Structure formats: structure tokens, C-alpha cells
């Protein structure tokens with residue numbers, strides 16, 4: 001039984017687990033703590049890129065953005081390497097999604113602009129997609145650090161699944177912008193041990209991970225069966241019982257995803 005299996009994993013990892021898979025033609029919604037709030041952590045970077053894509057002509061991707069030492073304040077595997085030359089918006093989108101680049105994300109927030117260094121406009125983008133639940137209040141590094149229970153910088157597996165569904169499978173973005181987003185998630189480098197690990201190799205998996213303090217580990221994905229039937233999978237977790245320095249546990253998500261893949265196969 002699926003809920004039994006998820007509860008078993010929670011006990012195994014001393015964790016809180018949230019899971020949502022939207023209903024399709026022949027499958028019921030899968031939901032476990034799906035309406036509980038979990039920190040976004042880096043999962044926000046996927047809808048962030050969508051916000052920036054949406055807001056601008058496609059060739060805004062070619063705009064060069066410069067930044068300096070005091071802009072590197074978080075894990076930034078790509079931006080740290082290009083600080084001396086700058087990065088285009090396209091390069092920032094790429095790094096934000098594929099390397100979960102924190103500086104790239106901050107610069108993209110600033111590009112989106114408005115109050116809160118773009119956090120207000122980011123939240124507004126989500127509201128435009130009918131998400132009245134999620135909220136972004138801080139950028140990197142602060143957004144991963146809110147205490148367990150605090151609503152700042154949170155989404156829910158349910159809310160984020162419906163947002164991702166519109167972005168990737170629905171018509172939130174024009175086809176060209178949709179393809180850019182989809183392809184970046186498809187080429188993600190951070191996700192091998194999460195949802196990807198739970199689905200057989202003949203299923204296509206695209207994703208954006210999140211990791212944070214208090215043992216936070218998330219992953220949002222779109223997967224396609226070997227016959228091209230897509231499902232959206234959101235998995236979020238925290239281990240508040242270990243305190244701020246609790247280790248995120250990817251294996252939770254891999255196991256949760258295996259359970260899910262078992263039902264969808």
C-alpha cells in the first residue's frame with residue numbers, strides 16, 4: 001500500500017515526506033502530505049527561468065550580465081567560473097537549472113526585477129498560473145534556511161506539481177520557450193540520485209532538484225513512459241528532527257520515486 005510505504009520511508013529516514021503526482025486519463029492523483037508546506041529550496045529555479053523566458057523576447061537570452069565578487073554568496077558551480085567575463089541570460093538560465101547555480105538564480109531574480117529583488121515578481125508569476133499557495137520571500141543563500149514550519153519560501157508538492165505541469169505539458173509558455181525550459185531540465189546534472197533513480201531507464205526523466213538546511217531534499221520532475229505518456233512527480237522532504245545541520249538524504253527521494261514508478265508502470 002502506497003501510503004504505508006511512504007510512512008515506512010519517513011520512519012527509516014527520520015523525515016517528513018511529501019509526494020504529489022497529478023491525476024491523468026487513467027491514473028488517480030498520488031498524494032502524501034501533498035498539501036503540507038515544504039521549502040522550495042532550488043526547485044524555484046525552474047519556474048524562475050520560465051518567468052524570465054515568459055517576460056522577454058527570446059533573444060533576451062543573448063544579453064550579457066556582469067557581476068562581481070560580492071555577488072557570489074551561495075553554491076554557484078558555473079557563475080564562480082565566469083565572474084571575470086559575465087554570463088548571458090541564457091547561460092544564467094542554463095546554470096540555474098542544470099547546476100542549481102545560486103548566483104545565477106539571484107541574477108535572474110534581479111532581471112525579473114521589482115520589490116524584494118524580484119521575489120515579489122516571481123511569486124506573481126506563480127499566481128498567474130493559479131498557484132495561490134507558494135511564496136518566495138528571500139533569494140540565495142537565505143531561502144534554504146527558514147525554520148521547519150515557517151511559511152516563508154515554501155511551496156507544497158501539490159502546488160509545485162500543478163505549476164510544473166502547466167510549464168512543461170500545458171500552455172503556460174509558447175512552444176519555443178517551453179522547449180528551452182524542458183531541454184534545460186532534461187540536461188539537468190544534479191538529479192541522478194533522485195527521481196531519476198526511481199524510474200526505469202526507458203522512461204524519460206527531466207527534473208530540478210532542491211537541497212536545504214534541516215535535511216531538506218526535493219525533486220520536481222516530468223517523466224514519460226516508454227510509450228510517451230507523461231506524469232508530473234513532485235517529491236519533497238525534510239529531516240527537522242536532526243536540526244539545522246541534518247543531512248539531506250537523496251535515497252529517500254529515490255525510494256519514494258521507485259514506489260511511484262511501481263504504481264505508474
Ligand SMILES: *C(=O)/C=C/NCC(=O)CCO
Nearest residue numbers: 041042144210211212213
Ligand atoms: C538549491 O536547492 C540550492 C541549495 N543550496 C544549499 C544546499 O544545497 C546545501 C544546504 O542548504
